Amino acid sequence: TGSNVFQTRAGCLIGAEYVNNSYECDIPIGAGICASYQTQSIIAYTMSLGAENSVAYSNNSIAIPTNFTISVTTEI
Amino acid sequence: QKLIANQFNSAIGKIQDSLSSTASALGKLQDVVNHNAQALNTLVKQLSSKFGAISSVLNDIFSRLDPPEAEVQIDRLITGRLQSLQTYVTQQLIRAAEIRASANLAATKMSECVLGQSKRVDFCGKGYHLMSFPQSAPHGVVFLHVTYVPAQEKNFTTAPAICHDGKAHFPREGVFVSNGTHWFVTQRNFYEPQIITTDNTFVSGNCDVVIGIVNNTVYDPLQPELD
Amino acid sequence: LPVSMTKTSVDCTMYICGDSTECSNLLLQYGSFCTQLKRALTGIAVEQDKNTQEVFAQVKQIYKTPPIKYFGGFNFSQILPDPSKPSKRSFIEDLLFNKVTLFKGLTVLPPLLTDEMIAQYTSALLAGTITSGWTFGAGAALQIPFAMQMAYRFNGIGVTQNVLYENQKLIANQFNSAIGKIQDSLSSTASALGKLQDVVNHNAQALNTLVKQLSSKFGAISSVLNDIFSRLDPPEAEVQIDRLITGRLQSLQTYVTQQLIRAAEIRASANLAATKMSECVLGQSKRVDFCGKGYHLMSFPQSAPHGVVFLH
Amino acid sequence: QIITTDNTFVSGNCDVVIGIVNNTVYDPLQPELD
Ligand SMILES: *[C@@H]1O[C@H](CO)[C@@H](O)[C@H](O)[C@H]1NC(C)=O
Ligand SMILES: *[C@@H]1O[C@H](CO)[C@@H](O)[C@H](O)[C@H]1NC(C)=O
Ligand SMILES: *[C@@H]1O[C@H](CO)[C@@H](O)[C@H](O)[C@H]1NC(C)=O
Ligand SMILES: *[C@@H]1O[C@H](CO)[C@@H](O)[C@H](O)[C@H]1NC(C)=O
Ligand SMILES: *[C@@H]1O[C@H](CO)[C@@H](O)[C@H](O)[C@H]1NC(C)=O
Ligand SMILES: *[C@@H]1O[C@H](CO)[C@@H](O)[C@H](O)[C@H]1NC(C)=O
């Protein structure tokens, strides 16, 4: 269509608008780029591996659970 | 016990709701069904392939061609369609090998999880596995993996050993936590602090060798019985 | 352990005809042959992507190592990411990626997960195992000193935890020496990464033989379809062109069958790699000879261009 | 380590075990005389 063009390792994607913030991979394209439909038009973004958190590691610090949850899951 | 039973019942209900609502929870069997259906469909469709002949209908070519000339076309069709069926058989063999691997994995999981308590990290689901329940499926087995997931973690200061009477004390089956200003012994996976005593600690070596050792008192259950 | 292979795609019309308009129409009379081959190749590519995801995406969060990299004397510099070089890879990872090195309708698609993201996943797993031990793989990550984690791991092999504390410095020194020796062993060894080389060489050889097979005339007068079209009238040309098309189609089908077999083998290898990751990196395995020779303490994952390297 | 009642447990008499040997087991509470 030529409305929009964006270069990528696996080629160039036409009809999608690149975004500068990451989301979860909905429609994989390649080279870390995934496409999704969000408020609406098709957008291209770099897939996010997940939330980033750093454990407060210390020489004399330990964390011990105070409660529990017996979660049951299904496997096929 | 009551809280654990309530949690188990609620999570079982949650599995029921998720199975009812989830669109593609059982994709690992629909995929096999679709693969078999597609294999059959492509085997049947390739029947109509011309294979370079004048027509794909044997009765038509036998009528519009002489036997000397129709023989070559019949050979073309027979060779092509035998090749098609051989390719289908090879794909079926590969799929059967994959299904055999899956069935071996399923049997191993059944044995380890349902008939026992596997100590493997992720073989019976995420978390510390307790038990699993098998459920039949049209072309597979569905496992409901019950696991123990710790929650509500609290940070505490700990020391590798406790120095008392010039000797180093280590936890027999617990962990040292200070609560800020009072040392206790707690199990690794649950916060059940207990007073430090000779019963739950063992002595080995002096306090100098151990790195990070801290000073605290160890209670002797027989100490009060002086008389 | 290899995990994924090259994602290959094949162009039917140009492979069979080499961009010739005449025989392109004739190829339609054969039917829907290579819809099946394209579908199989796409399935193989998605299977490789799934293999990489399963092997490396076992952790839901990207754990970050603390700035103060003191762990009771243990030195994880050779395995932790290097913040200076742009690749952000570890020394062992850089060595591994350096050792191994690697149209007529044949192209290679790029993997979904790039080397940088695989390295990020490996760094997250490494930070989790250094900072929280078994916990991060069974629920919420719980902080714990590395010395206490090592002591706990000793208890799993029937050795009292008092041994580590009375020999913490010696054990740390031996661990550092062994980690350093791994680098020398990998660099000097001629075929340390022989399996990944074998996988890449097999892929390249399959591609080359598929390309080379076109020069074969299959008993025809010539292997160039243009010459057959030019100097021969159609009545004697249809048979020859059909024979050449049949030969090339047979070659392509054989290539796809071998690719499927190799994909199944690499799927088995990737399943084994994921199992090893789960039972060695995310936990301690009591299985004998599973997480390396001898009583297993812990394992560290390292990214490779087409597989994973475990430091047991 | 010295043999004591803390790290050992009793089960049956001596004459039912093949290869049993004679040795002293120290009772930690014996010298205490509580
Ligand atoms: C994304 O953000 C970075 C940092 O602000 C900037 O350098 C870059 O130009 C941005 N790219 C786009 C496409 O907005
Ligand atoms: C734990 O610490 C708090 C505050 O430091 C203190 O009030 C409390 O008494 C301590 N626990 C025990 C059992 O003494
Ligand atoms: C580490 O913690 C232990 C126990 O609290 C303490 O004895 C030791 O001095 C600490 N060392 C450092 C370097 O903080
Ligand atoms: C512990 O107490 C002893 C005396 O009972 C003392 O010699 C030693 O220095 C103390 N250790 C610390 C770390 O304060
Ligand atoms: C860890 O080892 C590397 C390589 O031998 C060395 O350059 C580095 O200084 C070491 N780190 C520490 C803290 O000793
Ligand atoms: C062990 O001691 C008992 C009692 O003194 C004695 O009857 C027995 O023969 C001894 N056994 C050996 C092997 O000396």
Side-chain angles (χ1 to χ4, degrees), chain D residues 14 20-23:
Chain D
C14 308
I20 194 158
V21 298
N22 273 1
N23 202 247

Coordinates of all heavy atoms in Angstrom, one line a residue, chain D residues 14 20-23, ligand 6:
Chain D
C14 N 22.4 -57.6 71.0 CA 23.7 -57.7 70.3 C 23.8 -59.0 69.4 O 24.4 -59.0 68.3 CB 24.9 -57.7 71.2 SG 24.8 -56.3 72.4
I20 N 28.9 -57.5 64.7 CA 28.8 -56.5 65.8 C 30.1 -56.5 66.6 O 30.7 -57.6 66.8 CB 27.5 -56.8 66.7 CG1 27.3 -55.5 67.5 CG2 27.7 -58.0 67.5 CD1 25.8 -55.5 68.0
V21 N 30.5 -55.4 67.1 CA 31.7 -55.2 67.8 C 31.4 -54.5 69.2 O 30.4 -53.8 69.3 CB 32.7 -54.4 67.1 CG1 33.1 -55.1 65.8 CG2 32.2 -53.0 66.8
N22 N 32.3 -54.8 70.1 CA 32.1 -54.3 71.5 C 32.8 -52.9 71.6 O 34.0 -52.8 71.3 CB 32.7 -55.2 72.5 CG 31.7 -56.3 73.0 OD1 30.5 -56.3 72.5 ND2 32.1 -57.2 73.9
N23 N 32.1 -51.9 72.1 CA 32.7 -50.6 72.3 C 31.8 -49.8 73.2 O 30.6 -50.2 73.4 CB 32.8 -49.8 71.0 CG 33.9 -48.7 71.0 OD1 33.6 -47.5 71.0 ND2 35.1 -49.1 71.2
Ligands
LIG6 C1 31.2 -58.2 74.4 O1 31.0 -58.0 75.8 C2 30.1 -59.0 76.4 C3 30.0 -58.6 77.8 O2 31.2 -58.3 78.4 C4 30.7 -60.4 76.2 O3 29.7 -61.3 76.7 C5 30.9 -60.7 74.7 O4 31.5 -61.9 74.5 C6 31.8 -59.6 74.1 N1 32.0 -59.8 72.7 C7 33.2 -59.8 72.1 C8 33.2 -60.0 70.6 O5 34.2 -59.7 72.7

